[PDB]
Amino acid sequence: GHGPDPENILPIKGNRNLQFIKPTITNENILVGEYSYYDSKRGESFEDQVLYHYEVIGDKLIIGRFCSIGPGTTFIMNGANHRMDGSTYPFHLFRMGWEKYMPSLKDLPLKGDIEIGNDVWIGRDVTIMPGVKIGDGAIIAAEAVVTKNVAPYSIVGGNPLKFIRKRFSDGVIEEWLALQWWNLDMKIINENLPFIINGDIEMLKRKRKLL
Amino acid sequence: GHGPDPENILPIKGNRNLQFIKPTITNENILVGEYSYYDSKRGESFEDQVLYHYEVIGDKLIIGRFCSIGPGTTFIMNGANHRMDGSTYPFHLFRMGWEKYMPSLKDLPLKGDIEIGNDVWIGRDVTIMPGVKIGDGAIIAAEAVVTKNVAPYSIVGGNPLKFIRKRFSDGVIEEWLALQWWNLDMKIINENLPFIINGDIEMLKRKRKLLD
């Protein structure tokens, strides 16, 4: 059985910062696929990086498989959102007669769930805004503030986020998105690792005898 | 008078991070209005977020009332601004003969006070540069670097700062600025609170027309 145990929190026995995210999950509304890792700074858990995530709001954080999440990467959820109709001041938090002004969930600018695809490389100290969707194979530069959606297999970075370039031609991206090697069994992946790594997409298609 | 005590440092039960700024001010030249709060990370003091702030400079940091100041927000004052006529190296700091090369403040590029208005929402990890004016009701996006003045009731963000959009119409902004609910008595603030929150500016305008 080539490969590490995806349920083993600390796969690299010399390393104590790099953690497989999935088996560390405790909270709800957080779904992280197998083999996705978080390379922490001082050993902090991935969930500590998830901020403003209140069960009451119901927003979710979805991360696909085989994702590289750099140290300091922050996920800002909808809890950070202030009401923008009149004053942005959350009077209700202080109570003492102001709890009657408790906002409804429909009074708040809810941006939705954060969805991160598979095989995603997220640079160091990246901050991710609420409602952001990130496509498979996407690359996010370090120190980037992801203020919008990121296309599959695209390189982006900066504050606010800027589109740098697309990794492969539009046709090639289609083939990767049609293949979805991350959803295959580990037996198949291990037998296809060379072509996945060197990006020989036209060999993977021969490897998978389709109809 | 309903509402929390503005003198109360930690006004929320079971919260050790969100603080009322004004009653924490120990240092000078930091003028912060009532109800303006700082939601700290590890419970750190607001003043610790104020950098390069030396008293003799008379450099002032002004913040209005009812401001939301996110965690990690730092305020860069003039202070340690190196000379830019030649070498930016601060020789005088190391002394041992170099102390005579202390820059005259006439030779220093002072930008002036940091002035932040009322009802301002500043996101997490924002950096604010010297001499920056921020108008009432503005919104600073998270991780932003304020390198320029921010117009009242506008949304800004980025590094360097970019203008995103205006919060409301020009006419509606004028109505808020003519209102100045933060400058009204707490009695009548509570009396207008349901409208201040849902943004019923038309009602607020009517209430103030009545108050003449």
Next chain:
Amino acid sequence: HGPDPENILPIKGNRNLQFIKPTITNENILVGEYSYYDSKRGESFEDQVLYHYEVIGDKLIIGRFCSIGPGTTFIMNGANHRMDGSTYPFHLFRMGWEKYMPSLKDLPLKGDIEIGNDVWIGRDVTIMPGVKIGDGAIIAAEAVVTKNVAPYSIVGGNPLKFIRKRFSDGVIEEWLALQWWNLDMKIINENLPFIINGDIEMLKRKRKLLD
């Protein structure tokens, strides 16, 4: 006359501002005299050098009399992954994947980070791999240096933007021809009132009688 460049803590009472050169213990880090690091809480400069691995052999070079603000980070080439297909570092987890380690040809290595002399680097700046920064250049705070920085130019932001040139083209050439940082400390101490007040025309007179 002046401070001792071999003194780790040049200022009495200051436990944060360090001379970088006498603190260096690791390899491939070359820092000139009088260049200092004004740390947040006393941390060593080397700790601000990230993804610096011996197996790559990339170097960090910094001239003399550089001001480096707190939180400044230097990102080296050990960060980037293979980008031909999957950016997932399989080889790290081993257990049958160690064979999939990428060669140097497979990696998008950007080279060495070279910073000149008399360079002012603001607080919380991040330096990307392969970046060259000219002499006298000023790096604004919070900036992410994603490209080369011309000598005596002011830059900042993420990604890096060009703000302005400090002096005219002629004056810049004159500073670059002067190189006061290469003069003997006896000569520098005689010219400090001119190095600081920027009066370079008087320096050209003085260098003429020196040459």
